[PDB]
Amino acid sequence: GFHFQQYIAMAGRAINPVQWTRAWRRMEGKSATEVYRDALAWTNNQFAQISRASQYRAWWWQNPLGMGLVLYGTYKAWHMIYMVRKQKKTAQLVAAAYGQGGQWLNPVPR
Amino acid sequence: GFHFQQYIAMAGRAINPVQWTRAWRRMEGKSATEVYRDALAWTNNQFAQISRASQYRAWWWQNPLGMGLVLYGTYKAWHMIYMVRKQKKTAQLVAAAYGQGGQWLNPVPR
């Protein structure tokens, strides 16, 4: 793993409406195949940088579990940001629609 | 800051009853002045290691705020471990004795 700060900066640029106009202008004379190949090449470049530089270089976060801990932390962050947020909304929805625990209720006795 | 792992290990050794017998045996022919001077020398050695090595060396936790962030994190850890625990206990005590908010109640009206 590497360049998390650069990835945040990329997201920040992407969320900027000025960059939306810039991308609109850059899309002149351009194909979906070219865009997809560009993105795939970028991702490959990232993973190849990892595969190469891990052989001889160590980041500030190096630990006895290596990049496994960084990937776990990325996963846990994604989980807590997206899935737990969705869980909060779903909980409030179910509590407003049926009551707390309404989705685990037993079928009506016959 | 440095050697946090060593400090945890020191506390772990200190809490071991075998180390209590070892210290009891080591305390033979020993003075409180000697013990205090030893502890003071250890603390001075730590701070002198800091004062010297910060001039030329950077730890894995090095950041644009330097040791200020490490000391803030130490403080916050101490706070969350001790003081918030004490606040929880005091809250349950006050809630059992007077009710929630009992310490901020107004005086009895005359």
């Binding site: 940088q49 160590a58 | 950077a58």
Partner: peptide, 22 residues
Amino acid sequence: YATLGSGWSFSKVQYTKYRITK
């Protein structure tokens, strides 16, 4: 990226708890 070099030396590294300083 390709591993360039004319060397046959199988080389691995161990890391410290200190950062590179220039």
